[PDB]
Amino acid sequence: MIIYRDLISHDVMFSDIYKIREIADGLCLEVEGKMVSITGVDIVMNHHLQETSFTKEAYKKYIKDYMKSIKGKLEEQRPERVKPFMTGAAEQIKHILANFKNYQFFIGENMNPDGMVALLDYREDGVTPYMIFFKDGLEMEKCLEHH
């Protein structure tokens, strides 16, 4: 199976046992979760994601830093992704800041402040949870029977 982990913090963000949608012209991965009850969201609960908070200004400071960290990672391993990421993320930041009050913030288990901040949101029904990750900020891992 496929486990996805934060390219910076190395924590597991989510696995392939969820409905994954690639949105924003391949910039982001939209993971659909279920509300489960202690109450919460399954993605958060079984991958031990930690909730964190941001002012509008702190998030701007943080995401500039995060963008340049990913930019440096991509130049080394996936150079073709630098421009798409830099353009897309800049446009995605504008969207996130536009509906800032709609999001909750989650980071990996180790709580590395330089790692990815996943965004929690609810569908049109206002009941279904889904989480947004930057695809370029994730590295894939594959697990198989071993003897």
Swiss-Prot record:
Q: Where's the TCTP domain? A: 1-143
Tell whether ATP-binding is among the UniProt keywords: no
| Region listing for Required for reduction of TSC22D1 protein stability, in residue ranges | 41-143
Q: Give a brief account of the tissues where this protein occurs.
A: Found in several healthy and tumoral cells including erythrocytes, hepatocytes, macrophages, platelets, keratinocytes, erythroleukemia cells, gliomas, melanomas, hepatoblastomas, and lymphomas. It cannot be detected in kidney and renal cell carcinoma (RCC). Expressed in placenta and prostate.
GO CC aspect terms? cytoplasm; cytoplasmic microtubule; cytosol; extracellular exosome; extracellular space; multivesicular body; nucleoplasm; nucleus
Tell me the GO molecular function terms: calcium ion binding; DNA-binding transcription factor binding; RNA binding
> What Gene3D superfamilies would the database entry show?
Metal Binding Protein, Guanine Nucleotide Exchange Factor, Chain A
Q: Which UniProt keywords apply?
A: Calcium, Cytoplasm, Phosphoprotein
Protein induction: Down-regulated in response to enterovirus 71 (EV71) infection.
In its keyword annotation, does this UniProt entry include Hydrolase? no
Task: Tell where it localizes.
Answer: Cytoplasm
Q: Name one GO biological process term.
A: negative regulation of intrinsic apoptotic signaling pathway in response to DNA damage
One Pfam family hit: TCTP
Q: How does it assemble?
A: Homodimer. Interacts with STEAP3. Interacts with TSC22D1; interaction results in the destabilization of TSC22D1 protein.
Q: Which family does it belong to?
A: Belongs to the TCTP family.
The family database entries (PANTHER family) matched by this protein are listed as: TRANSLATIONALLY CONTROLLED TUMOR PROTEIN-RELATED, TRANSLATIONALLY-CONTROLLED TUMOR PROTEIN
Q: What does this protein do?
A: Involved in calcium binding and microtubule stabilization. Acts as a negative regulator of TSC22D1-mediated apoptosis, via interaction with and destabilization of TSC22D1 protein.
Would you tell me the protein name for this molecule?
A: Translationally-controlled tumor protein
Annotated organism of origin: Homo sapiens
Q: What lineage, starting at the top, does this entry show?
A: Eukaryota, Metazoa, Chordata, Craniata, Vertebrata
Gene encoding the protein: TPT1
